[PDB]
Amino acid sequence: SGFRKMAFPSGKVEGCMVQVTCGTTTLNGLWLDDVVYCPRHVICTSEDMLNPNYEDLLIRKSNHNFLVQAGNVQLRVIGHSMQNCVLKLKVDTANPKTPKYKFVRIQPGQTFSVLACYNGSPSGVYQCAMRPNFTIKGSFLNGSCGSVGFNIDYDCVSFCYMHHMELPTGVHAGTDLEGNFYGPFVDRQTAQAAGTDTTITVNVLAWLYAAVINGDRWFLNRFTTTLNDFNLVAMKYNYEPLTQDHVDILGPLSAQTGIAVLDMCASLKELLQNGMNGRTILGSALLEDEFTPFDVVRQCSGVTF
Amino acid sequence: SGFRKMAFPSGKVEGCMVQVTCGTTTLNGLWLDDVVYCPRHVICTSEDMLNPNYEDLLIRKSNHNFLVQAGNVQLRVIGHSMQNCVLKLKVDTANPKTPKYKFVRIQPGQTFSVLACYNGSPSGVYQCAMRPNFTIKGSFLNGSCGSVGFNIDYDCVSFCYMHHMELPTGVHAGTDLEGNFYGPFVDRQTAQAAGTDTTITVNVLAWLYAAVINGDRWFLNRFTTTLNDFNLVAMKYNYEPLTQDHVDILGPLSAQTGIAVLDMCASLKELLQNGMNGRTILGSALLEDEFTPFDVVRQCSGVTF
């Protein structure tokens, strides 16, 4: 029993992390087979910030202008190209530690592990959710760009996020590994704002199931509601509408606990309207929305990789 | 910016995990050089567990009663002994992935990462604190025994915990890698319970510093206090007493924020006596006590490994 913010084991990703330096600028890159992937803003200077002419900047660069190091050991760059907001540096050595991998684009509300890195060296690993406004609430400092997010699906590492920037509100934005931003963001320093964020309802419900599995059941009554009536309340509290597809995804947890999904919804409706009356759930005094239904199953059933 | 429950990168430990089977019983072991470490109750049957005579059970067993597997690779056992509550199995091949390592006994209040494993295969990584009552609030299922806790210092892995059991209250108890239990617990299935727990004051203070670094400042008040006065309030609220060495360990965070430690104590005093009043700190409505001062520095300064 117990329930923690648990990330995927990071070893497979640690062996891919390198440092990329262009001029005065160093960030992290992902080294897979004979290609290193990193944010293309490594080739910028401050004159470039509002209107970087990336094609011009790259044309002026030769392979020797990129210093790639793997554990402080130089790798020779032999080719360079750009895909969307990611730079692809072909190196003359293939990474012998490349895991089976795929590049995926995740959906809002889904989670992933982030391996936070500085100068090609990992600092720590933590779990993030893609927020409905396409930011993440990460933990990133100067030097962290090029850090990646990933899930492990079987023995395949599915990379889904590469870190580019922090908004003034303290939240984070980045791309998939093909260089396409999540959300309405660009890698030009215009003033950019995220939409208002909402709470990920399906994840809150999954976390309430996690609490029940762990014996933390005080908020359960033999109440039930309809999907429409639940949604009428949810939207008053800035929660995403719950769809029948979401109800379906909660099946496995409903099956384990014997608590119908619309009964759990009636419990959540009561918590929103009446509060928690000083009580905690799974050690939290707030309703948590960064565990997916799969996260709860994975953790409450012991899946390995 | 940002602040997350961050674990250490787990790669160095992943390469050390193996599966140990004795008859029908399988759990995890730690393979370092040519020794595999695991909990000694692997040699039991649930009939033994009232009063297991481990010395009898171990002397009767031969090396071939022990099946050790690194992935699919069988490691031949050439010796078996006991050290306190940990079995040591000498194998004929040294782990080629053995990192630089030490065995440490951690103190109450200190944190570590846990790599939760099943059948020798890593499932996830998360951060834990050693509670003042020598339990941890982990996340462990059947099959997880022999999972380890660790910290990393440079390139040295400091193993500090090996998992053995769950108390009926849902908390977890285990040993260091010399096989000595944390707290008063024993590896026999007798009624056992942990002392009442308390809150880790120095960690709460470190987390309040993390909040200021991150721009949460509302709870700062103009007052100061003394250690003696503050410790009177600490005991009222079941907080550990603060020592001068704790104050000194907070120095790096006081240095970065310019908030003196005894002014932060005054702020915490008022939080304890008036609550948060529907405000949050770092996205929590409770005072969090599972980040050490070094955890906050590591995370808010970008220390890597």
Ligand SMILES: *[C@@H](CC(=O)OCC)[C@H](C[C@@H]1CCNC1=O)NC(=O)[C@H](Cc1ccc(F)cc1)NC(=O)[C@H](N)Cc1ccc(F)cc1
């Ligand atoms: C790990 C054992 C394992 O993996 O072997 C494979 C068969 C397992 C970890 C717990 C399972 C659920 N959550 C856990 O953290 N440990 C046990 O199952 C442990 C076995 C044991 C029995 C007696 C003893 F003295 C030490 C270990 N049994 C328990 O955790 C349960 N709860 C019984 C128990 C044991 C000791 C106590 F003080 C109180 C309850």
Ligand SMILES: CCOC(=O)CC[C@H](C[C@@H]1CCNC1=O)NC(=O)[C@H](Cc1ccc(F)cc1)NC(=O)[C@H](N)Cc1ccc(F)cc1
């Ligand atoms: C120099 C070495 O290379 C890095 O390692 C840098 C990574 C670091 C991670 C940050 C650092 C603090 N914590 C984070 O997470 N990234 C940055 O500094 C970005 C760089 C960058 C400018 C322009 C743009 F288009 C894309 C990206 N600059 C901002 O983030 C600033 N906030 C300015 C800003 C504000 C809103 C917005 F939409 C875009 C840029």
